[PDB]
Design goal:
Blueprint (H helix, E strand, L loop, with lengths): L5 H6 L4 H13 L1 H8 L13 E4 L6 E4 L4 E2 L1 H13 L3 E6 L6 E5 H17 L7 E5 L4 H12 L3 E4 L6 H11 L3 E5 L2 E3 L2 E3 L1 H9 L9 E5 L13 E3 H7 L9 E2 L3 E7 L7 E6 L1 H14 L7 E4 L6 H13 L3 E5 L10 H9 L3 E4 L1 H9 L15 E5 L5 H11 L6 E4 L33 E4 L10 E7 L9 E2 L3 H9 L6 E9 L5 E6 L3 E4 L2 E4 H9 L4 E11 L3 E10 L7 H14 L8 E4 L13 H8 L9 H10 L1
Helix pairs in contact: 2-3, 4-5, 4-6, 4-11, 5-6, 5-9, 7-8, 10-11, 13-14, 18-19
The structure holds adenosine-5'-monophosphate-propyl ester.
Adenosine-5'-monophosphate-propyl ester (PRX) binds next to helix 11, strand 20, strand 24 and strand 25.
């Protein structure tokens, strides 16, 4: 156990007693609790209703603050202007540290109004989907907030997706517009963003895209399509800086994020406005102990939900200064992350176990010539953190003075679900600890029976909370199928967890067929598809194996079409194929050439033995197992 340090005790917004009192009210009386807590936002017309939700088959319906109206952008910008207009809303640090920016709330608001008008002039309307395929530059934020201001529904696509992966997202969502940049700048190198867009839009099934707006980030030679392609600067300069935000309903859709699942291709996890923003704002405030003047840095990409809730929306609703970093924590040197901390006097740092492990492998090279004294709070997200990593992070980065908040949540959950509160809860290395206000977790066996006491099982949430995803885009029936059918009347997270004698949770990872690779959520089925699309590949089974930096690696058992021979040319080729289908993020670390896939007489693939064998673990046609072991050895 780590005791709460005096300095945090002295300033904390929530102490142990307040966590107990608030947690208990949040469950016993959600309506008074979230009715009061909803006031963290400005409302145009006030809500009367608060909680109005159901996990019942086939009547899954999630509504929060439903008769209320509000604007996300007014809450994240306009309302801070009068008294804090001059406050820095975003600190931008470039890949190249010679390049930085302090954007004030007033500056940010002005550009958001301009871009809101640019979108409106382009014919974009409330409800339209807007694809954003951007690097980590302040214009992505501007684009996201402008979509929100006018009630367009934005769909941010992570910069590292391949042209094929971008096309799929645009096709599913029917995006009317793509907003991108000429190139991205990362670790001295360029991502060819706009080129990738070009390639995407050549897909014949892409039919909805009217225009591409392009930010001139590097000024590289790019192909231009006259009429379709527009420059960011050209358009924004033309636009009025004046814009009045109209009222959106609490349940007006806000964004879609394509998210990997146990079966099929990624689906558009849908979030609405009111409950989402309230949940984002509240979790940020309390979990990071946010006080005016705290300089906050979340290291997550804007193309993931952590970048949505905890780089942008939570921070800006609360009036915080939030830092956006264009680069990677270990470039030019492993000390970079701490140089950024030092340079911008970061007080709250929130990052990924994959990063921590990466800096850890380098030792004191990660902290060398740095100070780190400005830091008060650390945070970790996206994957289980091993105690040793947690210890190194606490000791080396936080100098043994900083609570570490290990925040468990998901894209589908909008905000933090199980998390320490730095002034309320005593820490255990590797534990996400206790549930947040409004959150009712439970552990059930594979049959659905609640497990009591210290125990493990399938992690479910037994009632709704405000930040919960409301649906899957254009497919509410699959939303129910996916999350509310395995354990009736419950939200199934897809994770396993254990609870200890203290009521602390230890999240042990996906129990479905979803991987965590360098903190990216990937379905095994989608990699298998990408593999099988290759004209030389008959059959593939993909499993995860432990990995000291990535957490899990992708290990692919591959069966070639009859008459095909493996080679070293083919190994790299197949890898490059998956990188083309999805992105570098999905490239398999290992390709296991085999004709010995273990199938039931019924045709089922024995995926448990594959998993065990792939992990260096040595104890219809039974003799395939033995052939698989030899092949592994070789
Ligand atoms: C939260 C931002 C990432 O959102 P995604 O929707 O991409 O991933 C959610 C999944 O990431 C893992 N995960 C996330 N945080 C933790 C965590 N703190 N501990 C263990 N596993 C975690 C859990 O397996 C979960 O089902």
């Amino acid at each position: 156990k780590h005791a709460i340090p005096a300095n945090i005790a002295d300033r904390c917004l929530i102490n142990p007693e307040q966590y107990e009192t608030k947690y208990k009210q949040s469950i016993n009386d959600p309506d008074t609790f979230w009715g009061e807590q909803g006031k963290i936002l400005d409302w145009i017309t006030p809500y009367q209703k608060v909680k109005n939700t159901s996990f019942a088959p086939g009547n899954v319906s999630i509504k929060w603050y439903e008769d209320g109206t509000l604007n996300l952008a007014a809450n994240c910008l306009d309302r801070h202007l009068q008294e804090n207009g001059d406050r820095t809303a975003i600190i931008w640090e470039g890949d190249d540290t010679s390049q930085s920016k302090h954007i004030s709330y007033r500056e940010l608001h002005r550009d958001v109004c301009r871009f809101a008008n640019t979108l409106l002039d382009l014919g974009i309307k409330k409800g339209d989907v807007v694809a954003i395929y951007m690097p980590m530059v302040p214009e992505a934020a501007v684009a996201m907030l402008a979509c929100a201001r006018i009630g367009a529904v934005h769909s941010v696509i992570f910069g590292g997706f391949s042209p094929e992966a971008v096309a799929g997202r645009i096709i599913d969502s029917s995006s009317r517009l793509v907003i991108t940049a000429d190139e991205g700048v990362r670790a001295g190198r360029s991502i060819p963003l706009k080129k990738n867009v070009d390639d995407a839009l050549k897909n014949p099934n892409v039919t909805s895209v009217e225009h591409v707006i392009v930010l001139k980030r590097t000024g590289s030679d790019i192909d231009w399509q006259e009429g379709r392609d527009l420059w960011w600067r050209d358009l924004i300069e033309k636009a009025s800086p004046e814009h009045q935000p109209e009222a959106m309903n609490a349940e007006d859709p806000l964004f879609i994020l394509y998210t990997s699942g146990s079966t099929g291709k990624p689906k558009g996890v849908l979030h609405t406005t009111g409950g989402y923003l309230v949940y984002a704002a509240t979790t940020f405030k309390y979990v990071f102990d946010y006080h005016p003047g705290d300089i906050y840095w979340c290291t997550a990409d804007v193309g993931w939900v952590t970048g949505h809730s905890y780089l942008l929306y939570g921070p800006l609703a609360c009036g915080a200064t939030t830092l956006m970093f264009e680069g990677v924590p270990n470039w030019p040197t492993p000390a970079r992350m701490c140089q950024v901390v030092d340079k911008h006097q970061v007080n709250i740092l929130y990052t990924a176990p994959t990063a921590i492990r990466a800096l850890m492998a380098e030792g004191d090279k990660a902290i060398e010539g740095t100070d780190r004294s400005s830091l008060r709070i650390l945070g970790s997200v996206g994957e289980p953190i091993n105690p040793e990593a947690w210890e190194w992070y606490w000791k080396k980065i936080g100098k043994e003075k900083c609570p570490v908040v290990d925040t468990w949540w998901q894209t589908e959950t909008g905000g933090f679900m199980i998390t320490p509160l730095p002034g309320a809860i005593e820490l255990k290395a590797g534990s996400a600890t206790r549930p947040f206000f409004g959150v009712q977790p439970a552990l059930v066996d594979n049959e659905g029976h609640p497990q009591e006491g210290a125990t493990e099982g399938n992690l479910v949430i037994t009632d709704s909370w405000p930040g919960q995803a409301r649906t899957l885009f254009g497919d509410h029936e699959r939303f129910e199928q996916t999350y509310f059918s395995t354990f009736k009347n419950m939200y199934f997270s897809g994770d396993g967890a254990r609870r200890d004698e203290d009521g602390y949770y230890w999240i042990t990872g996906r129990v479905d067929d979803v991987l965590n690779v360098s903190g990216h959520r990937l379905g095994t089925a989608e990699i298998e598809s990408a593999l099988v699309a290759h004209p030389k590949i008959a059959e593939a089974a993909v499993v995860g194996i432990p990995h000291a930096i990535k957490g899990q690696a992708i290990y692919a058992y591959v069966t070639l079409n009859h008459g095909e021979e493996p080679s070293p040319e083919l190994y790299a080729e197949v890898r490059n194929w998956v990188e083309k289908e999805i992105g570098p993020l999905a490239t398999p670390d290992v390709l296991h050439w085999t004709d010995s896939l273990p199938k039931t007489r019924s045709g089922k693939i024995m995926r448990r033995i594959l998993r065990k064998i792939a992990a260096g673990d040595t104890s219809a046609d039974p003799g395939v197992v033995e052939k698989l072991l030899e092949e592994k050895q070789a």
